[PDB]
Design a protein around this ligand. Structure first.
Ligand SMILES: CCCCCCCCCCCCCC(=O)SCCNC(=O)CCNC(=O)[C@@H](O)C(C)(C)COP(=O)(O)O
Ligand code: SF4
Ligand code: SF4
Ligand code: FES
Lengths: 83, 684, 112, 208, 94, 117, 47
């Protein structure tokens, strides 16, 4: 059971361009679809963008989003949501 | 259009209007001064800044003379040295021989400048003057006989503090600084006159006679009394905190600290929790070993899971402790991690950092043209922020408006009103101030965290976001939406994912409640189930501790290295100044130790590993002194419109209306005797 | 970089081997002369531990300098310059054990 | 006139400057800088390789007969890469003058021993090695003096605390004097005495 | 010099070992050295000098054998001017 | 990759468990002088200090409690820490930002900078 | 002293005491400062 999702992106790094596109376009729809799921958007520096999914009892898994297009990020988040 | 001037023959390019003293700073020479404070206005009364310009018959005051192209500043010429000696002699002619007993002794600009630029003997063969001492309050011990009429206190009170109560009475050698009447100088930044005073004429009454400057060890830290995040230097001698001094950080606090930050360290000396405590058979808390109490809470944690275990975080807790407790409760599958301050969860909430941050940084206030303050008293809630507002108002002609109860902010402001409907009026555009906001090139809107603590906080935030979006539609790099938090731990907790407000705990009463320094009292035993097991982990026993089955002694901000994030989102780390009293231990170490006993050992075993875990949860937490941030206002505003809550008709009233409220607002402040004396002073 | 005694790590290793040899054969003479109550094996085990302490070093000059220090200590022990106290200082007998697990450290004191 | 201030002797200043230029010309291979202090003291700055050549030159009469090693010491300045500054003080009895030669080294770079040239530098180099971490190559017998036989650290190094890391006491259980970690009953009180105002404008470093 | 409930002689600093404190053992067969003369009482006993000038100078007596000379302002009728070093009190007549 | 840790003789606990702070000391706000803010300083982490039972003097067991070092540049301090194997935290130098001062502004005809006294 | 008597002061001792080491009158060192940190007093009511 997903308990929260953390998305880390770099503000100006090229690798985080797709994640930034997802945030600017698709994040609002994602939050609408999952009103009470904590989707914490945070800024990371000089490191690859990552997606953190904290499940029940504290188990967490991280998937690298480096150089992922917005569609790829949407697919990754949807796969995490579906489980 | 840099012009060329020479300081002792060295070419330095300075912008026009630069003072001679500033060019001397540019080449590194520090012209001796007694009346010039860069923060304050220029006065030119000390006369120690008299320097000789080549080919100029008359010496000039470096603090007050704009440079001219081609001028050669002779900072060590015979004329300059002789002028310095004469000015020093005149200063010391009447000054009392109080150095051994003057608290300023050892850190006196008069003493050092006499040793460096003055004669080594006195030609004064007459009687010295004596001045009756004035009483200006319970904080500033005054010996006016030592005053040199540098006028720093007066100018500071007029410009920064904004309280025009200090002035010069009389003429000639009989001229005296101080209130002509028996008035008391009351302000948030009142204590800063002690720092600003070159001589020991104005000194700290609580700190008087306690210690000498050379003895003290200086530790650089960050204050936790407010969410401004003022940098401070904790002065400790022989393992005891002696005083708190401001540390310069141009972005956050220029050179000032609030009175509560400066004088509440006395609270750390009283009502301290030094040993673990467990309820006995009679129901009375008794001192116990760490192992016994930790085992008790470990058994209780093992017994229950999920919503049965919950955590409430106080205003003074640390990010390391927060993440440790968060992981511990998650290992029992509990997400009921709640702060004592309420932030609208509807919409993005904690998901987007820009939602709960002062997006326009404190330094940004200077650039702003119009500031709209909603339901907040920045003078008491965030004193340094109000000081920055006044600085911008004085220099940048900032236009300030307040929607709330009319309060004295030390600067003139437009009082739109106290009813929340004025937010709707601004958003629709019927209100005239909407036009001013639209015309404003750099508008700024600030919504205090106190207003969000009301029932209609979600509606208030939605209305303010509507105002901001209207502004954006009318006209970027600039950020117009800002939230001013009054609790230090709030920003860090929201970043780590702690649920804002205690509402979840109200919805689902927990069997085991862990109070992490929660002295607010939002949740009590009556709300909780009758057999609730309460754990309190904090430095002082104020409210949370007396209603706790187990008391785990914890360290204070002076006694631990921890990350505190200000309202701007800037993360700063405190440094250890004194060891925690008695058996008390650092909070994250306590959480990890309970994790080890309870069979769910958290991964981190050292402070660096805890910081790595913080980086995992939120990378910005470990990036110290960075306010880069990100702009997500579009998404947050879009999320806000989905719900339509209607604001209640109750007028916006800040929790703190008078300076009496400000003194005692937290456990450290309540414990302090000095703050209580100040409360008695203002009240009576 | 100018070599102290070895231009390469291998040569430093050879010198270390010589120093170890010398300490190894000296240990029983140390036990007999200083009237120490430890066994020869115990002393040689301490020698091995001390030598492995510096094993992580990956610079030839540092190895050479450590070898010089080892030679000086060995000369002291071969002579009676060091007293029985100095020789037993390697065996931290009086000092109480310092626990290394986190929970014990948390109980004992504020030290990290 | 000017009774307080120390009298200045320019003749000695000129003589020392001229002799410094003499030394600089004779051995340009090793000398890096020669300076004369205004209290009439001459210092020659030398590359580490030149300790033996330049000292031997100074001892033997190329118009210089410095045949007595006043003292040999080091100054540890951690900021510099070569944290140690080896300092030689020499006295010429024929010319009743003294000059100073200074060289640098690292913790890991040996410097040639000067026992051959002077023979008085044996104990001085031993003391430098014992206090500072400098190792002198080709020394007849490099070992510790002024420190305990089992002393581990190198004091005087600006990193070593004044109280050290170990303390000695007699223990009745083992009937022996035993070392223990230092635990001062009264912590040495560190005093911050430097004044916030500059004292000597002549030595003002460039702002950079 | 008052006596604490434990029977110890409280110091002029106010120092007395509490009944719980174990450090009282050091005086078990020995004595606690307390100076009977208290500075505060003796300085209180001194009469207040009355001087007819607004500003007066106290050297502590003995000239160079006393304390640095300071000038005290006596304008306030309510409160007597007190020497920072000597502690003697002065006031204008009437 | 220089490592003098074996040669220093420092016991391992202080080599590994101590965090050293590299910084330029802030000016003592009581004084306007800035001469004490021109050199980088290396200071070790604070440790426990307790009262001596006999006299109440503060006792310590940290050998490096009073150890402070002065470095001209940040890089030199960093290099020293690395060569000694101490974990280091570097605080960037804080410089007073340039200010615009005008004595004329105290008598502005229309601006708020006019001084009442 | 008979020719030149010492100055008479009230605080000066009237009876000189010899070295009291090894006697019940021996000086015993002790701290002259009060407790710095004050601990919280638990409430006496059960709840
Ligand atoms: C009573 C007994 C007293 C014992 C005293 C014995 C001593 O003095 S220990 C001094 C010896 N120090 C050394 O040999 C330094 C060696 N340094 C190294 O880096 C070596 O470990 C090497 C080069 C990595 C080789 O390591 P291996 O021996 O192959 O692994
Ligand atoms: S303020 Fe006056 S009396 Fe006090 S130390 Fe400075 S010069 Fe001396
Ligand atoms: S009281 Fe202090 S700050 Fe005010 S004028 Fe006098 S010397 Fe200046
Ligand atoms: S302070 Fe500069 S002229 Fe007075």
């Amino acid at each position: 059971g997903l308990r929260e999702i953390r998305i880390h992106l770099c503000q100006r790094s090229p690798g985080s361009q797709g994640v930034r596109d997802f945030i600017e376009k698709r994040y609002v729809e994602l939050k609408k679809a999952n009103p009470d799921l904590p989707i914490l958007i945070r800024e990371c520096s000089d490191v690859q963008p990552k997606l953190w999914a904290r499940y029940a009892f504290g188990q967490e898994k991280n998937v690298s989003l480096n150089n992922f297009s917005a569609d790829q990020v949407t697919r990754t988040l949807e796969n995490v949501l579906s489980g | 259009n840099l012009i060329e001037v020479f300081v002792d023959g060295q070419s330095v390019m300075v912008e026009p209007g630069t003072t001679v003293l500033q060019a001397c700073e540019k080449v590194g020479m520090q012209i001796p001064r007694f009346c010039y404070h860069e923060r304050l206005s220029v006065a030119g009364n000390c006369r120690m800044c008299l320097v000789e310009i080549e080919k100029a018959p008359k010496v000039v005051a470096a603090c007050a003379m704009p440079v001219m192209k081609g001028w050669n500043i002779l900072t060590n010429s015979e004329k300059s040295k002789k002028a310095r000696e004469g000015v020093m002699e005149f200063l010391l002619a009447n000054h009392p021989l109080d150095c051994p007993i003057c608290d300023q002794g050892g850190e006196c600009d008069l003493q050092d400048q006499s040793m460096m630029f003055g004669s080594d003997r006195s030609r004064f063969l007459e009687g010295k003057r004596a001045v009756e001492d004035k009483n200006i309050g319970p904080l500033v011990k005054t010996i006016m006989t030592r005053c040199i009429q540098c006028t720093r206190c007066i100018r500071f009170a007029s410009e920064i503090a904004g309280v025009d109560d200090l002035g010069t009475t009389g003429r000639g050698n009989d001229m005296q600084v101080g209130t002509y009447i028996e008035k008391m100088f009351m302000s948030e930044l009142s204590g800063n006159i002690i720092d600003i005073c070159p001589v020991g004429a104005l000194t700290s009454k609580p700190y008087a006679f306690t210690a000498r400057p050379w003895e003290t060890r200086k530790t650089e830290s960050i204050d936790v009394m407010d969410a401004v995040g003022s940098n401070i230097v904790v002065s400790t001698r022989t393992g005891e905190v002696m005083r708190i001094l401001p540390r310069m950080h141009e972005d956050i606090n220029e050179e000032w600290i609030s009175d509560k930050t400066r004088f509440a360290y006395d609270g750390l000396k009283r009502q301290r929790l030094t040993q673990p405590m467990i309820r006995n058979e009679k129901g009375l808390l008794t001192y116990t070993t760490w192992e016994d109490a930790l085992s008790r809470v470990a058994g209780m944690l093992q017994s229950f899971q999920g919503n049965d275990v919950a955590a409430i975080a106080g205003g003074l807790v640390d990010a390391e402790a927060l993440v440790a407790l968060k992981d511990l409760l998650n290992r029992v599958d509990s997400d009921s991690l709640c702060t004592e301050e309420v932030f609208p969860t509807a919409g993005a909430g904690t998901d987007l950092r820009s939602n709960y941050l002062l997006n326009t940084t404190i330094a940004g206030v200077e650039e702003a043209d119009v500031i709209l303050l909603v339901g907040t008293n920045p003078r008491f809630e965030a004193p340094l922020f109000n000081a920055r507002i006044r600085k911008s108002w004085l220099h940048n002609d900032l236009k300030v408006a307040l929607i709330g109860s009319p309060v004295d902010l030390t600067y003139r402001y437009d009082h739109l009103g106290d009813s929340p409907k004025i937010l709707q009026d601004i958003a629709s555009g019927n209100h005239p101030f909407s036009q001013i906001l639209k015309e404003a090139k750099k508008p700024m809107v600030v919504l205090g965290s106190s207003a969000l603590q009301r029932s209609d906080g979600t509606a208030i935030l939605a209305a303010v976001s509507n105002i901001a979006q209207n502004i954006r539609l009318s006209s970027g790099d600039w950020k117009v939406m800002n939230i001013l938090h009054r609790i230090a731990s709030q920003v860090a907790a929201l970043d780590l994912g702690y649920k804002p407000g205690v509402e979840a705990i109200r919805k689902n009463p927990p069997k085991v409640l862990f109070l992490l320094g929660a002295d607010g009292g939002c949740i009590t035993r009556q709300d909780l189930p009758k057999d609730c097991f309460i754990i309190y982990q904090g430095h002082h026993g104020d409210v949370g501790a007396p209603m706790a089955d187990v008391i785990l002694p914890g360290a204070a901000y002076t006694e631990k290295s921890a990350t505190y994030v200000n309202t701007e989102g800037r993360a700063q780390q405190t440094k250890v100044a004194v060891t925690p009293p008695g058996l008390a231990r650092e909070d994250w170490k306590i959480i990890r130790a309970l994790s080890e006993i309870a069979g769910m050992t958290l991964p981190y075993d050292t402070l660096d590993q805890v910081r790595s875990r913080l980086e995992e949860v939120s990378p910005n937490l470990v990036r110290y002194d960075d306010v880069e941030g990100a702009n997500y206002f579009q998404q947050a505003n879009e999320l806000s419109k989905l719900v339509n809550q209607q604001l209640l008709a109750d007028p916006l009233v800040p929790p703190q209306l008078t300076i009496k409220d400000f003194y005692m607002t937290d456990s450290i402040s309540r414990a302090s005797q000095t703050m209580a004396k100040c409360v008695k002073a203002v009240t009576e | 970089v100018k070599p102290i005694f070895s231009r390469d790590m291998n040569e430093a290793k050879r010198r270390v081997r010589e120093l170890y040899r010398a300490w190894y054969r000296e240990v029983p003479n140390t036990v007999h002369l200083f009237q120490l109550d430890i066994s020869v094996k115990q002393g040689r085990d301490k020698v091995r531990e001390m030598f492995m302490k510096n094993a992580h070093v990956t610079d030839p000059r540092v190895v050479d300098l450590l070898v010089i220090k080892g030679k000086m200590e060995l000369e002291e022990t071969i002579n009676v310059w060091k007293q029985r106290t100095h020789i037993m200082r390697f065996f931290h007998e009086t000092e109480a054990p310092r626990p290394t697990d986190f929970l014990s450290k948390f109980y004992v004191g504020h030290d990290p | 006139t000017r009774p307080t201030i120390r009298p200045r002797n320019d003749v000695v200043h000129k003589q020392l400057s001229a002799f410094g230029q003499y030394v600089a010309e004779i051995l340009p291979k090793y000398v890096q800088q020669v300076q004369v202090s205004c209290f009439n003291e001459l210092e020659i700055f030398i590359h580490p390789d030149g300790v033996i050549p330049v000292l031997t030159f100074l001892r033997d009469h190329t118009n210089a007969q410095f045949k007595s090693l006043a003292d040999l010491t080091a100054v540890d300045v951690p900021t510099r890469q070569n944290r140690f500054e080896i300092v030689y003080n020499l006295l010429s009895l024929r010319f009743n003058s003294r000059i100073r030669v200074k060289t640098y080294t690292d913790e890991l770079t040996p410097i040639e021993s000067s026992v051959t040239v002077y023979k008085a530098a044996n104990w001085y180099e031993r003391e430098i090695w014992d206090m500072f971490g400098v190792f002198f190559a080709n020394h007849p017998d490099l070992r510790r003096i002024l420190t305990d036989y089992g002393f581990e650290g190198h004091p005087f190094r600006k990193d070593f605390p004044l109280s050290g890391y170990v303390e000695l006491r007699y223990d009745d259980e083992v009937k022996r004097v035993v070392a223990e970690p230092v635990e001062l009953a009264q912590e040495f009180r560190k005093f911050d005495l430097n004044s916030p105002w500059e004292a000597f404008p002549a030595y003002r470093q460039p702002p950079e | 010099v008052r006596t604490s409930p434990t029977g110890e002689k409280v110091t002029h600093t106010g120092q007395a070992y509490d009944d719980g404190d174990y450090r009282r053992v050091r005086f078990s067969d020995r004595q606690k050295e307390v100076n009977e003369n208290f500075a505060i009482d003796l300085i209180a006993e001194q009469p207040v000098s009355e001087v007819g000038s607004r500003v007066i100078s106290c050297d502590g007596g003995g000239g160079a054998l006393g304390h640095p000379r300071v000038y005290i302002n006596l304008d306030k009728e309510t409160k007597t001017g007190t020497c920072g070093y000597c502690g003697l009190q002065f006031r204008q007549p009437h | 990759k220089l490592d003098i840790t074996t040669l220093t003789g420092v016991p391992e606990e202080h080599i590994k468990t101590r965090k050293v702070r590299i910084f330029v000391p802030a000016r003592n706000n009581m004084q306007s002088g800035v001469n004490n803010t021109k050199k980088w300083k290396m200071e070790f982490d604070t440790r426990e200090r307790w009262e001596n039972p006999l006299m109440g003097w503060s006792s310590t067991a940290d050998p490096l409690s009073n150890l402070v070092l002065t470095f001209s540049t940040k890089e030199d301090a960093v290099a020293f820490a690395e060569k000694n194997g101490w974990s280091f935290d570097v605080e960037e130098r804080k410089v007073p930002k340039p200010k615009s001062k005008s004595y004329g502004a105290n008598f502005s005809w229309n601006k708020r900078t006019r001084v009442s006294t | 002293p008979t020719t030149k008597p010492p100055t008479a002061r009230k605080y000066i001792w009237t009876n000189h005491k010899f070295n009291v080491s090894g006697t019940p009158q021996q000086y015993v060192p002790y701290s002259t400062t009060r407790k710095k940190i004050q601990e919280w007093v638990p409430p006496s009511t059960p709840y």
